[PDB]
Every structure is written in C-alpha cells, then in structure tokens.
Design a protein around this ligand. Structure first.
Ligand SMILES: Nc1nc2c(ncn2[C@@H]2O[C@H](COP(=O)(O)OP(=O)(O)O)[C@@H](O)[C@H]2O)c(=O)[nH]1
Ligand SMILES: Nc1nc2c(ncn2[C@@H]2O[C@H](COP(=O)(O)OP(=O)(O)O)[C@@H](O)[C@H]2O)c(=O)[nH]1
Ligand SMILES: Nc1nc2c(ncn2[C@@H]2O[C@H](COP(=O)(O)OP(=O)(O)O)[C@@H](O)[C@H]2O)c(=O)[nH]1
Ligand SMILES: Nc1nc2c(ncn2[C@@H]2O[C@H](COP(=O)(O)OP(=O)(O)O)[C@@H](O)[C@H]2O)c(=O)[nH]1
Ligand SMILES: Nc1nc2c(ncn2[C@@H]2O[C@H](COP(=O)(O)OP(=O)(O)O)[C@@H](O)[C@H]2O)c(=O)[nH]1
Ligand SMILES: [Ca+2]
Ligand SMILES: [Ca+2]
Ligand SMILES: [Ca+2]
Ligand SMILES: [Ca+2]
Ligand SMILES: [Ca+2]
Ligand SMILES: [Mg+2]
Ligand SMILES: [Mg+2]
Length: 168
C-alpha cells in the first residue's frame, strides 16, 4: 500500500485530477488505484484535501503516514503558483520533514487557450511556463516537476507513475 496526499489551493483541480485518474472520467475523500510496478501490482491510496483557509487546522491531520505528496497548482493561476512557495511547501515540509514531494502543474489544456490567456492578460498575468514550474520545483526540493490535464488526461498517468517511483 502507498499513501499519496494531494495538496494545493482551492480550485486548482485536485479533485478532478484524482477522479480522472482513478475512474477515467472527468467530474461534472480518498480513492484507490492499482498500479503495476515491475510486474508487481501495488495499491495506491489517494487522499484529497481541502485547500481553503478555514481547513488550515484540520488539514494536517491527514498528513501522518503519507508516503508521497503532490503539491498542485494551476498553470493558469499565478496566485496558486506563488502559494506553493508561500504556503504549501512550508506547511507540508515542516509537518513532514522527509516525505518526497512532487510539484504538479494542473490544467495544462488551458495554457494555450486564447480566452484564458486574454483574461489573464487583463490583470497583467500570464500562464505559468514549464521553465517557471521547474525553477519552483528545484527551489522547494521537489523530486520531480510534472504538468498535466485532468480533462484531456495528458500527463496524468505519468504523475502517479512518478509518485510511486519517488516512494520506491
Ligand atoms: N480545463 C480544465 N479544467 C479543470 C481541470 N481540472 C479541474 N478543472 C476545473 O477546475 C475547477 C476546479 O476543479 P477541482 O478539481 O474541483 O479543484 P479543487 O478545488 O482543487 O479540488 C472545476 O471547474 C473543474 O472542472 C483540467 O485539467 N482542465
Ligand atoms: N514553517 C512552518 N512553521 C510552522 C508550521 N506549523 C507551526 N510552525 C511553527 O513552528 C514553530 C514551533 O512550533 P512548536 O509547536 O513549538 O514546535 P513543533 O510542534 O515541534 O513544530 C512555531 O514558530 C510555529 O508557528 C508550519 O506548518 N510551517
Ligand atoms: N518531525 C516533525 N514533525 C512535526 C513538526 N511539527 C509538526 N509535526 C507533525 O505535525 C504533527 C502535529 O504537531 P503540531 O505540534 O500540532 O504541529 P505544529 O503546527 O508544527 O505545532 C506532529 O505530530 C508531527 O507529525 C516538526 O517540527 N518536526
Ligand atoms: N527518510 C527519512 N524518514 C524519516 C526520518 N526520520 C523520520 N522519518 C520518517 O518520517 C515520518 C515522520 O516521522 P517524524 O518522527 O515525524 O520525523 P522525524 O522528526 O524526522 O523523526 C515517519 O514515517 C518516519 O519513519 C529520516 O531521517 N529520513
Ligand atoms: N521538457 C519540457 N517539456 C515541456 C516544455 N514545455 C511544455 N512541456 C511539456 O511537453 C508537453 C506538451 O506541452 P506544451 O505546452 O503543449 O508544448 P507544445 O505542444 O510544444 O506547445 C507537456 O507534457 C508539457 O509538460 C519545456 O520547455 N520543456
Ligand atoms: Ca511543527
Ligand atoms: Ca503546523
Ligand atoms: Ca527528521
Ligand atoms: Ca530532528
Ligand atoms: Ca522528530
Ligand atoms: Mg476538491
Ligand atoms: Mg521542528
């Protein structure tokens, strides 16, 4: 059994990431994947979390016995990205000083969307680029930086393959 916990700001796509991986369906708790690893079936337990401020005292109770964290931010929310540094990495790493952390950029499908880009440009903002995410990942000492889209499933299998590889 491997326990994986997904953390990050509200609305970055954590729930959709988990449901899309485990069910292969995109939505309109804790979940269960089986993965083969070198011809050995392995159970992967995926724990969703509430990223909101009003869960700040309760959320860390989910952290004990975690084998790997995914810190999620949305590739089209620069604020969710800044909070990796300002909130997420400092909380998880302090509470869990040795657990591997993967950094995952979500909503990869929106990064080249014209209207998402234009709405962002209105507030002097821009989607997060791969180089930017990679730099964040190295700064916080993440095992790996990965980008994905729960919606299209691009990159999604790799996220959980790499989560398991970090553990094993
Ligand atoms: N375009 C796109 N939208 C997504 C994706 N994942 C989640 N969303 C949307 O982002 C919003 C927040 O998703 P959710 O999984 O509930 O985020 P959570 O609050 O972090 O659990 C919802 O409207 C989802 O439909 C994705 O990969 N691509
Ligand atoms: N960076 C970080 N510091 C924290 C967190 N939670 C508590 N602290 C701080 O750690 C320091 C010592 O906390 P204390 O309860 O005495 O000791 P601890 O329980 O062994 O961590 C205080 O400054 C706390 O505010 C966290 O999630 N991240
Ligand atoms: N190893 C380690 N674990 C910590 C630390 N602070 C919190 N934890 C973990 O978080 C749990 C709750 O401890 P608590 O004192 O409420 O955390 P605080 O917010 O850092 O003061 C502990 O039982 C540990 O599992 C720390 O400084 N080192
Ligand atoms: N990899 C690694 N894991 C550790 C270490 N110390 C404790 N752990 C594990 O980290 C998790 C949290 O344990 P905790 O007592 O909070 O950490 P500690 O203060 O570093 O001993 C547990 O699963 C421990 O077995 C360490 O030095 N290295
Ligand atoms: N190694 C690397 N991968 C990237 C870079 N930019 C995007 N990707 C990844 O390659 C895949 C396609 O990303 P995308 O932004 O669509 O690249 P594009 O099709 O050339 O525009 C995704 O899995 C991304 O995570 C980059 O600069 N370096
Ligand atoms: Ca502490
Ligand atoms: Ca704390
Ligand atoms: Ca330690
Ligand atoms: Ca110590
Ligand atoms: Ca200790
Ligand atoms: Mg959710
Ligand atoms: Mg301490």
């Amino acid at each position: 059994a491997i326990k994986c916990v997904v953390v990050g700001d509200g609305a970055v796509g954590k729930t959709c990431l988990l449901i899309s991986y485990t069910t292969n369906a995109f939505p309109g708790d804790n979940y269960s994947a089986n993965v083969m690893v070198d011809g050995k079936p392995v159970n992967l337990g995926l724990w969703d979390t509430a990223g909101q401020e009003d869960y700040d005292r309760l959320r860390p109770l989910s952290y004990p016995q975690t084998d790997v964290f995914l810190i999620c931010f949305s590739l089209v929310s620069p604020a969710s990205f800044e909070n990796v540094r300002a909130k997420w990495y400092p909380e998880v790493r302090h509470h869990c000083p040795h657990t591997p952390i993967l950094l995952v950029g979500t909503k990869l499908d929106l990064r080249d969307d014209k209207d998402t880009i234009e709405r962002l440009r209105d507030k002097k903002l821009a989607p997060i680029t791969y180089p930017q995410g990679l730099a964040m990942a190295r700064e916080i000492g993440s095992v790996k930086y990965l980008e994905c889209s729960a919606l299209t499933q691009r990159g999604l299998k790799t996220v959980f393959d790499e989560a398991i590889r970090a553990v094993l």
